[PDB]
Amino acid sequence: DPMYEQFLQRIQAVRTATVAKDISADILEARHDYFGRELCRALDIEYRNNVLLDEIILDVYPGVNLMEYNVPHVTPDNYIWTGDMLLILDYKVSVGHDSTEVTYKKYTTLILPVMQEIGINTEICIIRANPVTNQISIVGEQFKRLFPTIPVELNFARFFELRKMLLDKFADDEEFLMM
Ligand SMILES: COC(=O)/C(O)=C/C(=O)C1(Cc2ccc(Cl)cc2)CCN(Cc2ccccc2F)CC1
Ligand SMILES: [Cl-]
Ligand SMILES: [Cl-]
Ligand SMILES: [Cl-]
Ligand SMILES: [Mn+2]
Ligand SMILES: [Mn+2]
């Protein structure tokens, strides 16, 4: 478990609230990426993690003149180009809905206008795993139509253990409390 052992080594050595806070964010990012790999594997789709919107456009429409459009330089996690429709994909790991709503609004308002200008049928798709219950939530009707079941086998226990160890090391640290 080289990813686990690297985190553990960092948790053993950390002494300051600011370095611990970076450890915490790093753990949350790695558990998010773990879900993305596992999800794409279960669905047997190409795994990507942050593709520049400009690059997505060139992949689906090679003859595009990028400079004739105002392309927001967002980096959604992944996409599916069926040949007829573009599914923009972002992974989430959270017990709650709020981060899904933030990214939904952002990618709806920033990606959909230019894609309609370009002429590319696009759907914004956000796939959330609850890290405690392993239940999967999907926004994106065409994604659900393409993938009615998702046979993932998720275990988030090790990410919770690492983060709990770090939070317990700093549970009497006022600074870290705030961060
Ligand atoms: C869960 O879905 C996302 O949230 C997502 O995939 C976010 C990201 O890709 C970034 C890395 C990250 C991944 C998972 C977690 Cl847990 C935490 C962080 C990298 C891209 N930046 C976008 C950005 C870039 C520059 C300025 C402001 C910004 F918002 C967000 C974090
Ligand atoms: Cl430190
Ligand atoms: Cl110090
Ligand atoms: Cl982005
Ligand atoms: Mn991302
Ligand atoms: Mn994401």
Side-chain angles (χ1 to χ4, degrees), residues 2-4 7-69 71-83 85-134 136-157 159-160 162-171 173 176 179:
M3 196 217 66
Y4 180 89
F7 275 127
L8 182 73
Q9 135 70 9
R10 289 170 70 192
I11 297 165
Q12 255 273 285
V14 64
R15 304 173 59 74
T16 65
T18 187
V19 174
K21 148 78 217 163
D22 291 337
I23 297 172
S24 172
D26 278 1
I27 293 173
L28 289 181
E29 177 165 356
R31 101 178 166 176
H32 153 288
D33 298 344
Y34 157 77
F35 173 53
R37 290 189 313 266
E38 198 53 62
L39 167 76
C40 294
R41 177 217 74 62
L43 301 184
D44 206 4
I45 66 180
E46 184 73 14
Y47 170 70
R48 305 172 188 103
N49 211 338
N50 294 345
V51 197
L52 182 69
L53 180 52
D54 307 67
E55 167 77 68
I56 300 171
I57 293 165
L58 290 161
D59 184 57
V60 300
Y61 179 30
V64 75
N65 186 1
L66 219 49
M67 308 198 302
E68 218 271 295
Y69 305 90
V71 176
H73 300 309
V74 293
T75 61
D77 289 324
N78 204 350
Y79 64 96
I80 308 181
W81 177 233
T82 64
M85 190 160 30
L86 179 63
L87 315 179
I88 298 293
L89 265 47
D90 211 86
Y91 329 124
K92 299 277 161 191
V93 185
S94 182
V95 292
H97 303 322
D98 278 326
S99 72
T100 300
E101 275 154 55
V102 170
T103 303
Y104 181 74
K105 302 221 180 123
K106 186 181 181 195
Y107 286 171
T108 291
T109 61
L110 284 185
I111 302 185
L112 291 190
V114 63
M115 296 311 269
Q116 279 171 24
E117 264 172 271
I118 292 165
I120 292 162
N121 205 5
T122 304
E123 166 175 277
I124 303 312
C125 316
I126 303 171
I127 305 99
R128 169 166 75 92
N130 189 306
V132 184
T133 70
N134 296 323
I136 305 291
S137 288
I138 298 165
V139 47
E141 288 320 299
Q142 293 302 309
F143 193 92
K144 304 186 180 160
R145 278 273 307 230
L146 252 65
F147 307 109
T149 74
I150 303 102
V152 278
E153 202 43 18
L154 302 172
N155 186 17
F156 293 102
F159 298 98
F160 178 100
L162 292 168
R163 205 144 165 298
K164 182 215 188 193
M165 277 187 278
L166 170 75
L167 275 280
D168 286 353
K169 182 173 201 184
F170 285 85
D173 191 298
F176 188 77
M179 313 182 58

